[PDB]
Every structure is written in structure tokens, then in C-alpha cells.
Write a protein that binds this ligand. Structure first.
Ligand SMILES: Nc1nc2c(ncn2[C@@H]2O[C@H](COP(=O)(O)OP(=O)(O)O)[C@@H](O)[C@H]2O)c(=O)[nH]1
Ligand SMILES: [Cl-]
Length: 292
């Protein structure tokens, strides 16, 4: 009989894709079908629409694991019993789903994934953060075996030809008196990054939500660039521009993570040759990690 693992996540794409890689791994390991359920995504206005096909091409199989990733989540009844055991409660008992319950489920799923024996539950529902609960091969398999929609890929390609080709790009991811120090730290990270050697002429690719950070970093360093800014359509367009930056960061020669705890730059950490960041354990000090 067919048995399932459901990967639910509705936050930023880095978290959604790392978490999916943990769902996928358990499905691989126990001979289950993997269901990608992105209903309720922060990027899609309508609440019951599965967001995965809005940004990615259809996928029916990942490295041997069958995959359901479309609006079939709205017609199929996935069978119980369920794990975690909360998912066996009546639906009126499931309206209340506080953070304490989500975090318990992360911990329960983590225990299950470390256990030797498969669960007897016919459907595993993953609806908590599962970052760091899989191998790096799992993560790499997800990114290699799903594909961005043509419309998003064309923009990545255009930008790549316009700014990346023929050059070595230092990528800078900046999330967010406090603004004075932060600006200063970013500048010192960029000077460190620029002191290294590269094969091709250098340009600086800046990914930030602040117009003021763009403008100032642009005035303090040559050859800085960013992706231009262009209801439900602003949902989609926010998702798309998030993916465009996430994927371009992973084509840089060096990437600065401010901060390093962001899942947004996880893909870049996996592929890019050099990562620069603030060592939180020794705060205020810059460290450089060479990729294997
Ligand atoms: N377009 C774009 N989106 C980003 C960038 N960095 C982060 N984001 C997204 O904007 C939000 C940033 O995370 P944050 O506001 O700290 O809260 P979070 O949901 O816990 O990650 C998440 O949706 C990120 O995936 C970026 O450089 N460009
Ligand atoms: Cl890889």
C-alpha cells in the first residue's frame, strides 16, 4: 500500500527547500511517496493553492522517490494513522496550533529520523522547520532535481549575461545608530572580500531590502549592482525576485552572509568557493570559510 511524507512549509524559500530535503530523505529511506504541500505560502495570496508549481516546473520523481507537487493535495485523502500523533486529532481540535506544538513536532520528527525502525504511521506530516535534519547530499539532490519556471530562468540568464559573465562577483546578502555599525560592518566585509584574488575583473552583487544600504554601499565601492525592482501579482513577483537573488548568489566567487544564520544563502554556502561572515561566537570578527 502507498505511504506518504508530506512536506509543508510556507516561509522563505531557503527554509522551504532545506526542509523539503529532510522530508525527501525520510521518504527515500522508508519507501514512501513525497508530497510537496506549499498551500498557504507567504508568496501566494490564495490560501488553498499549492505554491510549488507557481515557481517550479512539475516533478514526479526525485532520485527514485515518487513526488506529488501540485493541486492533487486538494483532492487526495492521505491515509492514517498519522505521525506526529497530533495529526490524528479531530479537525476542530486542530484549529489551535501554537508555536509550542510546532516546536514539539520538529523535535518528534528529529527523534523519528534518527530512529532505526520506520514509523508505522502511513502518512508523516512535516509542518515545522527541518533545517539541519538531513545530509548535505539530500540538500544537493533537491537543488539539482527541481527546476525553476522558464520565466524565472530567463531573468536569471539575462542578468547573468549582463553582469556575471566575464567577471568574478562578490555576492553580499544583507538582512536589514544600529544602522551605522551595520553599514560599517558590511563595508569591512566587502574590503576583506575585495582583498582576495580573483581570475576575472571584480564586481559586487548586493542583495538587500534597504534602498539606503544599496545607495551607501554603491557610493563607497565601485561596480556595485543589484537586481532592479519591478496584490497576488506582488505575491508572485516577491517570490520570483527572492529566487532570482538566491540563485545568483550561488554563482558568485565569494559570498558575504550578513548574517550567516539565514537559510536564504544556504544554497550559496553549498556551491560557492568562499564564504565570508561574522563569527557570532567571536562577535565583530570576520572569518572566511573555503568550500570543499
Ligand atoms: N528578494 C529577496 N528576498 C529576500 C532576501 N533575503 C531574504 N529574503 C526573504 O525575505 C524574508 C527575510 O527573512 P526575515 O525577514 O529575517 O524572516 P524569516 O521568515 O524568519 O526568514 C524571507 O522571506 C527571505 O527568504 C533577498 O536578499 N532578496
Ligand atoms: Cl551539488
Amino acid at each position: 500500500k502507498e505511504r506518504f511524507v508530506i512536506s509543508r512549509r510556507r516561509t522563505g524559500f531557503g527554509d522551504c527547500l532545506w526542509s523539503l530535503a529532510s522530508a525527501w530523505s525520510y521518504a527515500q529511506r522508508t519507501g514512501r511517496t513525497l508530497v510537496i504541500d506549499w498551500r498557504g505560502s507567504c508568496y501566494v495570496e490564495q490560501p488553498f493553492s499549492n505554491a510549488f508549481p507557481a515557481f517550479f516546473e512539475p516533478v514526479e520523481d526525485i532520485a527514485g522517490v515518487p513526488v506529488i507537487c501540485d493541486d492533487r493535495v486538494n483532492q487526495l485523502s492521505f491515509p492514517g494513522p498519522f505521525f506526529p500523533r497530533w495529526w490524528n486529532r479531530p479537525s476542530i481540535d486542530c484549529i489551535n496550533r501554537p508555536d509550542e506544538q510546532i516546536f514539539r513536532e520538529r523535535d518528534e520528527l528529529t527523534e523519528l529520523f534518527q530512529a532505526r525502525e520506520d514509523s508505522e504511521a502511513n502518512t508523516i506530516v512535516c509542518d515545522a522547520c527541518l533545517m539541519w535534519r538531513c545530509s548535505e547530499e539530500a540538500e544537493r539532490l533537491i537543488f539539482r532535481n527541481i527546476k525553476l519556471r522558464s520565466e524565472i530562468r530567463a531573468r536569471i540568464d539575462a542578468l547573468y549575461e549582463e553582469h556575471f559573465s566575464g567577471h568574478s562577483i562578490i555576492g553580499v546578502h544583507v538582512r536589514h545608530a544600529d544602522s551605522e555599525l551595520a553599514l560599517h560592518q558590511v563595508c569591512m566585509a566587502i574590503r576583506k572580500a575585495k582583498a582576495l584574488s580573483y581570475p576575472k575583473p571584480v564586481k559586487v552583487f548586493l542583495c538587500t531590502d534597504s534602498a539606503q544600504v544599496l545607495d551607501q554601499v554603491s557610493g563607497l565601492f565601485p561596480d556595485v549592482f543589484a537586481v532592479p525592482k519591478r496584490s497576488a501579482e506582488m505575491g508572485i513577483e516577491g517570490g520570483a525576485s527572492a529566487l532570482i537573488d538566491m540563485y545568483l548568489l550561488a554563482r558568485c566567487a565569494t559570498v558575504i552572509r550578513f548574517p550567516p544564520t539565514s537559510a536564504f544563502t544556504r544554497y550559496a554556502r553549498l556551491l560557492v568557493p568562499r564564504i565570508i561572515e561574522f563569527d557570532l561566537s567571536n562577535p565583530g570578527h570576520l572569518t572566511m570559510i573555503d568550500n570543499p
